[PDB]
Symmetry: D3
Subunit: 69 residues, 6 copies
């Protein structure tokens, strides 16, 4: 599928924290940056994610805030 979400950042899975109904996936997206994603365990299983998998961090623009020092 092609998605409206303005942010679709390729990266490699660095870690997966398995929980009860959710888990947290950490992706290395390059440039020294990592992104953490809290999603359903069903989705982690259905996408076959494991440490080392290639994936994307997907974020709708209305979910992104801006901060300054």
């Amino acid at each position: 599928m092609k998605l409206s979400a303005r942010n679709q950042l390729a990266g490699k899975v660095v870690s997966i924290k398995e929980g009860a109904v959710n888990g947290i996936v950490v992706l290395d997206i390059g440039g020294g940056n990592q992104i953490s994603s809290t999603i359903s365990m069903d989705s982690i299983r259905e996408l076959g994610l494991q440490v080392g998998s290639d994936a994307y961090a997907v974020i709708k623009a209305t979910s992104v805030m801006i901060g300054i020092d």
Copy 2:
């Protein structure tokens, strides 16, 4: 403040699209990646954002989905 949001990514403002009550800020966070943020125009003014400003893209972990190739 220090925020619980797991994602706080430093970058430089590449463009700002001004709208009616919202605008869209694009940040270059390095590594060839950019992040687009849709926030209120009031916040854009109050934070003093301009093209070239140093800023952060801040994203709660529960807002991030994972994708894989087809």
Copy 3:
């Protein structure tokens, strides 16, 4: 791409209201249900959406509340 979002509902575009930076797309997903989506105008153009387009309403499970009478 394939997405973790638990909700990916097929439907056809019934209307698009254009704004300044955002627009509102209404999708008929059948069975008398319609979904309204508020997204960037850039995405609306990039996905080539028009009245009648086939599309999907995509919703992260953590964005769905449950209500009762």
Copy 4:
């Protein structure tokens, strides 16, 4: 209460997966579609939800993305 959320879709609870502080509720909203919801266990209990309960999937318009096949 009347809510601003543009999406308020009636359906029946088909399943509830209990987690630690959250659970996942699945609603059959008709037309062969289901909606899955991740909400607090406290709310699942307070709303008295069970398999067979009548409910609504409530989604703010700004939370809905659009996808296409792109073929």
Copy 5:
């Protein structure tokens, strides 16, 4: 309707900024605190919101971040 959203804060409408497809509603919830809401212009009209209207700010718990000083 009854909603699972764990946050439902009564207040009075102090201001409405109209936009193109969205507007921004500000509620006085008391104690010197205000809540700003970015919602569709359709909802603002359909709910009959005006300066002075009694209303509620409704927020899903997964939408709330926690911050601290320093």
Copy 6:
């Protein structure tokens, strides 16, 4: 950091329910209102949250719905 989030509500922590990857923090912001926040356990620990902590409820404007009687 300074954040674009239009809602930054001072309060004191009255409860913490720990989960597997998330926990739920309840902040009393005065006037008889309490705000519940579902965030990662990592964040709860990293912010040093305990009953009695001074903190802020931070909410993006696009996450706030309006309801009426």
